[PDB]
């Protein structure tokens, strides 16, 4: 089931992991360019959604407020999770927000392209990335409107 | 996780429900044109897959062997589940085969367009159709290669 509370197109938000409380950032300098962060609110943690239409219906691109790049999640090459210019040129720029079946207030950030979800954990390494497999709590996210 | 054993493109198969053991048919006369069936093998129970490309990656159109129509699964009009010509012209002609997280040998037939899965049950009515909500075993299917 699609997450029922997806931010309106163009509305800005942070993506915060339910359990770690860490947020995703997407920046242009100092790798990793996309990772998780536990610290002050900064602009590179701010995103908006591009609403998919046509074959992208019920999918979304996740666009950085300060730099305009969209997220990608892939398994073809490292890094698995990163950013790229544009507004969803590539298939792995498109995400589904899938409501958790036990906690209706959180969702997974799912890639149809790579059949992965994003995760945030404190251990083991890598502490942030994407994953194909069972439904763990460390895959659960919130939208945090700003 | 996508079902790991999706029939090769162009290979033929029946779609059989795990619990009821009923098969899907897709025909051109005598409504319902797409429904479930408990009886002898007939050609209108035979399907092949069109493999989704580009924005349809990891999605599939389910095409009838004898009549060539593709399945649809929608919530926009009645009937919810049916067939149509055009080799996947409409978004609701595209399906993801999602492995069950407890039974690795079955999958759900999921519509990204309508956020529904196909189900098969003996009761209550409607006995066959689509559904958005919790996971139930009557949503689970097998590919039966011919
Ligand atoms: O949407 C991501 C997109 O990335 C492309 O590869 C990029 C790569 O991420 C970057 O490090 C490099 O400098 O430029 C490449 C542009 O081709 C992939 O080709 C594409 O499939 C997607 O994965
Ligand atoms: O992919 C299905 C497609 O159906 C269209 O509606 C059909 C309808 O199913 C049929 O009974 C009628 O005779 O013709 C209609 C138009 O082709 C929908 O318009 C479309 O959105 C899809 O749902
Ligand atoms: O996987 C199907 C699921 O269906 C639920 O029943 C639905 C029913 O199909 C629909 O016609 C009605 O409007 O809503 C019902 C409740 O959501 C069953 O409750 C469930 O057990 C499954 O059979």
Give A76-128 as a DSSP string.
SSSSSEEEESSSS-SGGG-EEEEE-SS-TT-EEEEETTTTEEEEE-SSSSSSE
List all residues 6 or more positions away from A49 whose beta carbon is below 8 Å from its beta carbon: A6, A7, A9, A10, A11, A60, A61, A62, A63
The single residue listed with the structure tokens 């924005």 is B55
User: Which tokens is A8 given?
Assistant: 């309106």
The number of folded domains in chain A is 1
Q: How far are the Cα atoms of B65, B72, B81, B95, B130 from residue B114, in angstroms, in the given order?
A: 25, 10, 11, 10, 9
Does residue B42 have its Cβ closer than 6 Å to ligand 3?
Answer: no
Q: Dihedral of the CA atoms B109, B112, B114, B120 (nearest 10)?
A: 10
Contact A112 B1 (CB under 8 A): no
Q: Which residues of A touch B115 (CB under 8 A)?
A: 1-2, 58
A4 Cβ contact list (under 8 Å, min separation 6): A99, A104
Per this entry, what is the length of chain A?
146
**Cβ contact, residue pair B56, A55, below 8 Å:** yes
Would you state the structure tokens that stand for residue A137, as one six-digit string?
A: 């709590």
The count of CB pairs under 8 A between chains A and B is: 40
Tokens, residue B97: 């085969």
Residues B112, A54: C-beta atoms closer than 8 Å:
no
CB B94, CB B84: distance < 8 Å: no
Tokens of B100: 């069950």
- CA B130 – CA B117 distance, rounded (Å): 5
As a whole number of angstroms, the distance between CA B46 and CA B86 comes to: 18
* C-alpha distance from B45 to closest chain A C-alpha (Å): 27
Query: Which residues fall within 8 angstroms of residue A78, CB to CB, at 6 or more apart?
Result: none
Q: Give the resolution value in Å.
A: 1.4
Q: How far apart are CA A89 and CA A92, in angstroms?
A: 9
The CB density around residue B34, as the number of other CB atoms within 10 Å, is: 25
**DSSP conformation class of A42:** -
The two three-digit tokens of residue B136, written as one number? 């139930």
- Report chain A residues whose CB lies below 8 A from the CB of B58: 112-113, 115
DSSP A2: B
Helix (H/G/I), strand (E/B), else coil: B105 = coil
| Residue A110 · residue A97 · CB < 8 Å | yes
Burial of A84 (0-12, 13-18, 19+ CB in 10 A): middle
Q: Which of B17, B7, B46 is nearest to B109 (CA)?
A: B17
Distance A19 CA to ligand 2 centre (A): 44
Domain that holds residue B120: 1-146
Q: Please answer whether residues B74 and B92 qualify as being in contact, where contact means their C-beta atoms are separated by less than 8 angstroms.
A: yes
Residue A105 belongs to a domain with what CATH number?
Answer: 2.80.10.50
Q: Which residues contact A17 (CB under 8 A, 6 or more apart)?
A: A23, A36, A120, A138, A140, A141, A142
* Method for structure elucidation: X-ray
Question: Which ligand 2 atom is at minimum distance from the Cα of B72?
Answer: 1
């Amino acid at each position: 089931v699609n997450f029922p509370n997806i931010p309106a197109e163009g509305a800005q938000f942070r993506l915060r992991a339910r359990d770690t409380g860490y947020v995703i950032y997407s920046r242009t300098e100092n790798p990793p360019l996309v990772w998780q962060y536990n610290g002050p609110p900064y602009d590179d943690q701010l995103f908006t959604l591009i609403y998919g239409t046509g074959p992208h219906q019920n999918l979304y691109a996740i666009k950085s407020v300060p730099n305009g790049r969209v997220l990608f999640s892939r398994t073809s090459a490292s890094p698995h999770v990163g950013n790229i210019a544009g507004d969803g040129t590539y298939n792995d720029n498109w995400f589904q927000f899938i409501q958790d079946d036990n906690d209706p207030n959180s969702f997974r950030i799912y890639s149809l392209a790579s059949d992965t979800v994003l995760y945030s954990r404190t251990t083991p390494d890598p502490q942030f990335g994407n994953y194909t497999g069972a439904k763990y709590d460390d895959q659960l996210w919130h939208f945090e409107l700003v």
